[model samples]
Target: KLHKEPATLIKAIDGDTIKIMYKGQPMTFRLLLVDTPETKHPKKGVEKYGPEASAFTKKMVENAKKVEVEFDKGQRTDKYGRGLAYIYADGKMVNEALVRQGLAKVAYVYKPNNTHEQHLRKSEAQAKKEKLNIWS
Candidate 1:
């Protein structure tokens, strides 16, 4: 089973990452199973569709009335110590939405954080078929 807990979205650091207040402390989460274009990177600079992805994620979480963080069964944090989890904004899965819009692609896979892997892949496929954003 997954670990789902209430969290307050403090800010969206980028498309696939955010900072939230959880368990009485602020935590950074790198949304599992997906990767969006780079918006803020020292060397890569901004990739195509980067700003759009960041804006989409920011708009969703920042304006959401309630947010939750769901952790997978595998590792909880990446090498950088950012929590590897999925985010739900007002009950809607943010990961799926991002892939559905082609703002993100299913990338990072380190099971059993693979819980939403298949689901997000399908969403990404549909976005590719529709030629949205990055997929375009």
Candidate 2:
């Protein structure tokens, strides 16, 4: 029921970043409204679940045929010139999935676009309960 763009998943640069091909062109994405721990930034060392976040994202998204980036209202690229996207792989929202699994947090640089904010809140609480990330 919706029109889509051309796509291909190149790789997961890290937990919070992905390299992809859009319309046959190479591009990178900083998943909008989400941020995982600092696994890639050596100076920052690894945040809790940092490796887990990277692994989770790679396991879910790498080799996926095409990535569908559904943009939120009034949002486009980030200030860093990277496309701000909500990544979906094989009809599943990778962003939300990661947050649900406690691999990443719902990054709210702008407005929150969560249709399942309550569920995500529950997930956050559970992750905290288990000391999955920051709580650890």
Candidate 3:
């Protein structure tokens, strides 16, 4: 059911956070297994490409209905009480796609749930090597 179904992307708060109205209730998604520079927070200085990352994420989900959600761990919520999830749109996982686009860095705090650890690293490296977002 995770990959097969499509979910409507309700709103994108930033590069790493989103809110979706599922079953008529708003569900906030804190993307799992990765972290992006703080672009929206007031306290933290915006990280490089923060705006670009946010824009990219926004563009990717715009008009995309019927999205998919994938969970790797039993606990659905993170320490901050946010729903940690990996997203897929039209058969494409947004997690890997973000990395592929150099929008975020691989966050490996939890070892087991990182489905794309290797891929994230590779993607990060490629992004860094090519200066995908950094150079811009």
Candidate 4:
């Protein structure tokens, strides 16, 4: 089971990653179950649609009155030491919102770690059908 923790938005690194102050400590959170275009690519330089995705995320986080995150079942952090979670801003699921608005794609499914896989997939399908942003 997953549980939520409150956090204060510090910065949005990209469409799927954010920095927040949690429990009086700063932490980096990689949003679970979705992936956005690359804004800072090492080899490819910035990818198409990257800036739009990042901007969307920044606005969502910055304008929210409250932010909360819930870790994956039994896993708290990823290999690179970045915290992984499903982010909610003002009660909105940021992950699902991004996919629904066509700002992101449903990417890797880490098996049992995905709590919102069905919802994410549904949002992606809707975005694709409507040809929104990245889908366009």
Which candidate gets the maximum TM-score versus the true structure?
A: 1
lDDT of 4 by residue, 4-67 (tens): 8899999899878899998888989899988888887668767888898899889999999889
1 versus 2: better lDDT goes to: 1
Misplaced by over 4 Å in model 1 are: none
Question: Which ten contiguous residues of candidate 3 have the minimum total lDDT?
Answer: 1-10
Q: Model 3 scores what on Cα lDDT?
A: 0.73
C-alpha lDDT score of every prediction, in listed order: 0.89, 0.73, 0.73, 0.88
TM-score of 3: 0.83
Weakest ten-residue segment in model 1 by summed lDDT: 108-117
How well does model 4 score by local distance difference test? Answer: 0.88
Per-candidate TM equals 0.96, 0.78, 0.83, 0.95
Count clashes in each candidate, considering only residues at least 3 apart in sequence or on different chains. Answer: 0, 2, 4, 0
Which segments of model 4 are wrong by more than 4 Å? none
Q: Which is the winner by TM-score between candidate 2 and candidate 4?
A: 4
Name the better of 1 and 4 by TM-score.
1
Report each candidate's C-alpha RMSD, comma-separated, in the order given: 1.0, 3.0, 2.4, 1.1
Q: Report the number of the highest-lDDT candidate.
A: 1
Model 3 residue 49 CA deviation (Å) reads 1.3
Candidate 1 TM-score, C-alpha based: 0.96
Native-to-model Cα distance after best TM-score fit, residue 20 in candidate 2, in Å:
0.7
- Rate residue 7 of model 4 by lDDT: 93
